[PDB]
Every structure is written in structure tokens, then in C-alpha cells.
Design a binder for this molecule. Sequence first.
Ligand SMILES: Cc1[nH]c(/C=C2\C(=O)Nc3ccc(C(=O)N[C@H](C)c4ccc(F)cc4)cc32)c(C)c1NC(=O)[C@H]1CN(C(=O)OC(C)(C)C)CCN1
Length: 503
Amino acid sequence: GKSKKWKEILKFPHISQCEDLRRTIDRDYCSLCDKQPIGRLLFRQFCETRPGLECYIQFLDSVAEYEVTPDEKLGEKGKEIMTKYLTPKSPVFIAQVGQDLVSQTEEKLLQKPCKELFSACAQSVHEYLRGEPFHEYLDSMFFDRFLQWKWLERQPVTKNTFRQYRVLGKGGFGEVCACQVRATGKMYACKRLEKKRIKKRKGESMALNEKQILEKVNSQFVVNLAYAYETKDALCLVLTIMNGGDLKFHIYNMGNPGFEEERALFYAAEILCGLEDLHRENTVYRNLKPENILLDDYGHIRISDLGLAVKIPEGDLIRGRVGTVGYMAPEVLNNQRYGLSPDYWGLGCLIYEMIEGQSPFRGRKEKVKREEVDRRVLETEEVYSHKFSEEAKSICKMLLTKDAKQRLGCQEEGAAEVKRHPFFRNMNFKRLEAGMLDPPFVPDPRAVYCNLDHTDDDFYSKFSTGSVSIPWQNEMIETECFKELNVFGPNGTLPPDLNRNHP
Ligand SMILES: Cc1[nH]c(/C=C2\C(=O)Nc3ccc(C(=O)N[C@H](C)c4ccc(F)cc4)cc32)c(C)c1NC(=O)[C@H]1CN(C(=O)OC(C)(C)C)CCN1
């Protein structure tokens, strides 16, 4: 449902409009050719024009396919890749990897196949593209086209940029609206935080914290910020839409209560990956409970409520005591200084609750006051049942270790220590992260599973940063606005918008 005149809205500016862009965008290879979606495509498309470069983009594609290849078909896929790219007389031959590394790769295949066999060649290839190919791309019309896309990304976003639909629930201050970007037709979930209620509470720092944690996290398993704009009355956060309901509803209304272990395995795997992405930004979630794990239209989950998240400075501890009764780690209950450990405690509570259909310290059919629940979180060992394999018991109690120093995932190794746990022994994370493992439950599309003071002006300016680069570029790709608009001249000639001669 794109706006009637969307090709006018996303109409490319003339390349002469982007000179300021050209002089300020940092020419970092990883940013312009990989991390940024549209930059990645444009650079790949530049390599589509040089015969020598084309072979390298095809190779990196086959390596990615190899990484998520099932363990049994690794030898087959490896032998294929070997005889297709790294053999000398091939029409598609990787020459910059050097015969000194292609002979090594032939030995890796002579022994057990590993999912990392081509990692050495892949870096060698990127080491080559960082040089002459990248700097050629910079002086090509595809980087001028990239600057045109950046120019659109920077355009101001406003209330008129969106199309509000229905009320998607309510929370602190305001409610989740349902945005649709007029120009592209993509759906989102507004988060209208009312201005009069932020100032009345004096909670301005809490709004920017959430907005800034959201724009930095770039996870498949955490709600991502796409836009941040102000609309006179309220500040808005445009977020990933999740129409599949929350995990609490699926544990208790759709569950036994509870899930089969293998089903909870899948959700735990995706939640662990969410926490891992947050921890890369040394950010602690602290709100891990079933109602905050949402499902999407496909059945995948994302962590949603980041209102209690904070960015921990590197080499620092914080003091808080926040969250929900029953889902506060003991170090949080005691108001101690902690790091990321509360989230691995929450993961434990989630895995337990998914398998057993009740909390490990409160019975589903138990009327108990908070004093006893908290006392239990601090003093009693949770007990398991025949719904848990020995592996499931192990990870839950390791994650539910009262002492954060001895708790799983709270060492220097981080989330990797949790992924190694025998509970994920049958879980292939590369494939999960690549979205290749089918979710265990697919929501049906049709279903519904549920003043003038300038001191405020400086706060609105730091919030209303507008578009978020990576989410925005991905939006252009999903809606096919990129495929449709990213057209050049007939026979690789410069289109009018990229020729500095006739504007
Ligand atoms: C599609 C959808 N998604 C999500 C939530 C989020 C999501 O997708 N990303 C997020 C990121 C962040 C948060 C988050 O932290 N928000 C907190 C609380 C907050 C803070 C401040 C504030 F001001 C407001 C909220 C939330 C989500 C929801 C919640 C729904 N909709 C429903 O469940 C509806 C459906 N409904 C109905 O009956 O059917 C209809 C015909 C469709 C109407 C009526 C009532 N239940």
C-alpha cells in the first residue's frame, strides 16, 4: 500500500546535492560495503560490472551458504566450493587468496569438514576488496547512487511521514500505535510517549536511554528502532511490529500450560541470541519475563520492553533494584552492584517457566505474598520434574545459581558459555541466526493473540534524531522501493540524476 506519489517522495536528488554528504561520510569499508544494507548491495553491484571482481562476490556467497549447511552435507558443499573457485583453471578463480592458502584449504577438506573451513579464504578476499576494488567503487557511479540513498535517509521524518492505524496496547505514559510508512507501505509499532507525562514525572533521561539503547541494538531477536520523531504533544518511537502475541499468552493460554522441551529450546535459543546482541553493547536488559517476549508473523521472537535497560560502562557495575516481582535476580533484590548477570538469571526463569508451565519460585496455583516469593528467590533451591531432561535441569539450575560469580554466562566468556551448554547440543546457532530453522508455532495472519520552557527543547532535539540508518535501508529493500528505484542508464550509462552536467 504505497502512497500514490511515492516515487516522487523517494525521488533521487541530483548528485550535485550530495557534496556535503561526500565530504563527511567516513569511507570505512565494512560500513559502506557490508554493515549498511544498501551500501552492501551497491558495492556488490559495482563488482557485477568488473569481470575480475565478480568471482569474489560469488565465492563469499557460497561460503555463507557453507556456514549454515547441515553438518552432514559439509564435505559435499566444501568439495563443490573447492572445485568451483579455488582450482586454477576454473573460469571463476580466486587468485588473490594466493596458492599458499588454497593448498591449505585442500588439506582441511582431506580431514574432517568444519563449518569454518573457508574462514581463512574469506578474510583474504575481504583484505583484497578493502583495497583497490573499494577505492574504485568510491569513484564509481554506484557510490554516487549510495550518496543519493543516504540523502533520502537523512530527510526529516514527521507525523505526515506515517499513517497511524489502531491502538496496539498501552503501557507507561502512552500507547503503542500502528504506523505505516506512507511512501513504502511498511508496518511498524509507534510508541507514543506523552510529553506532558514525561516532564510531570521528570523521566526525560529514561526516555532517551531507551531510545538510544534501541537505535544501537541491531538484533534479529530484539525490537529495533526505525524512527524517532516528535509530534507536539508526544515523542514517538517507531518499532518492529509483532503480531504473533507474547510468550506469556502462549505458555498459559496455548500451552499445557508450558511447552515441550524442544519447543522451549527454540525460544531459549533466540532469547539467548537477543541477550548476546545487547551484551555486545554492554547493555543489561533486567526485564526478562514471558510477557516481554513477543512473536512475529512467522513465529520468531524478539525482546520488546527495553524501558529498564541501561548501558553499562566497560569495566563498571551498576546499582538498581528494578523489574517485576518474581523475575529479579538475588543480586538485584539485595540492591548489590551487578553487571550483566541479571539477564542470565532471567533466561533461567524463562527456560524453567516454558518447560514447567509455572514460575520456579511461585506455583501457578499458589496465593503467596511478595515477601515469600523474594525469600524463595534468595534461599530455596528450585525443584524440577520429568518434563526436564538432565540437560534442561542442568542449564536451568546453572542459570539460576544464586551467586552471580558462579552463574552460567557471567564469566569472561559471556553468552558463548551458554551456547556450549549440552542443553543446546542439538541446536545449530549459525542456522538459527540465519533464520533457517522453522519456528515451532506459526501465528495465523488473521489471528489476534492477546511547556514553552527551552529546557524541554534541548531534550526534544537529542531524541528526535529521525531515521535509523540500517533499519531504514532494510525498509527500502523489503518494500522493493530500492529494487524499483535503483535504476541506471541503458547499457551501464549514467542516468540523468547521476550526471553532473544537466541537473
Ligand atoms: C501488534 C502489537 N505489538 C505489540 C508490542 C510491541 C511491538 O510489536 N514492539 C514493541 C516494542 C516495545 C514495547 C514496549 O515496551 N511497550 C510498553 C508497554 C509501552 C511504553 C510506553 C508506551 F507509551 C506504550 C507502551 C512494545 C512493543 C503489542 C502490545 C501489539 N498489540 C497488542 O497486543 C494489542 C492488539 N489489540 C487487539 O485486540 O487487536 C487489534 C485489532 C490489533 C487492536 C489490542 C490490545 N492488544
